[PDB]
Design a protein around this ligand. Structure first.
Ligand SMILES: [Zn+2]
Ligand SMILES: [Zn+2]
Lengths: 50, 108
């Protein structure tokens, strides 16, 4: 029973799987900024804008 | 408000005189007549009515997962991730929530 560095290696088909997620996450998160600046984001909990 | 006297430079307090109320002070002789109307408008900040807390709408915020709960046979499951040090060496713990007609909370 042994462990090497070949055990933990990213797959080529895995690098583009998380690339899509990171791009969609960035595109979705960087919209709420100007959404708040314009005045939006209806709030369910009692809280402040930020 | 804040009113001072031009001659001396001190402040004034209003008190009764002979025929009508007067703007007086205790540092220099200076009295101004009180006439038809003197008043100022103030606007205290009025209270807001607050929100109702709790409900499934609040749980819509955090993301759930797909994992069975051995209490009511539902894939309905909310997951939580927290850090805490155990007795030997730290390991990330996770909380389990059932999104169903029972809705219990466990910590594995
Ligand atoms: Zn004075
Ligand atoms: Zn349950």
């Amino acid at each position: 029973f042994s462990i090497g560095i070949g055990d933990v290696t990213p797959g080529q088909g895995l690098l583009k799987a998380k690339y899509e997620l990171l791009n969609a996450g960035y595109k979705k998160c960087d919209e709420y900024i100007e959404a708040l600046n314009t005045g939006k984001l209806q709030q369910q909990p009692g809280c402040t804008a930020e | 408000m804040l009113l001072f006297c031009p001659g001396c430079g001190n402040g004034l307090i209003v008190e009764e005189g002979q025929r009508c109320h007067r703007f007086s002070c205790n540092t220099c002789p200076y009295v101004h007549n009180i006439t038809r109307k003197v008043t100022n408008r103030k606007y205290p900040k009025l209270k807001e009515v607050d929100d109702v807390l709790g409900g499934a709408a609040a749980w819509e915020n955090v993301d759930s997962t797909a994992e069975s709960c051995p209490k009511c046979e539902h894939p309905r499951a909310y997951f939580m991730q927290l850090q805490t040090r155990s007795a030997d060496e730290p390991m990330t713990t996770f909380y389990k929530c059932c999104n169903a007609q029972c809705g219990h909370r466990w910590r594995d």
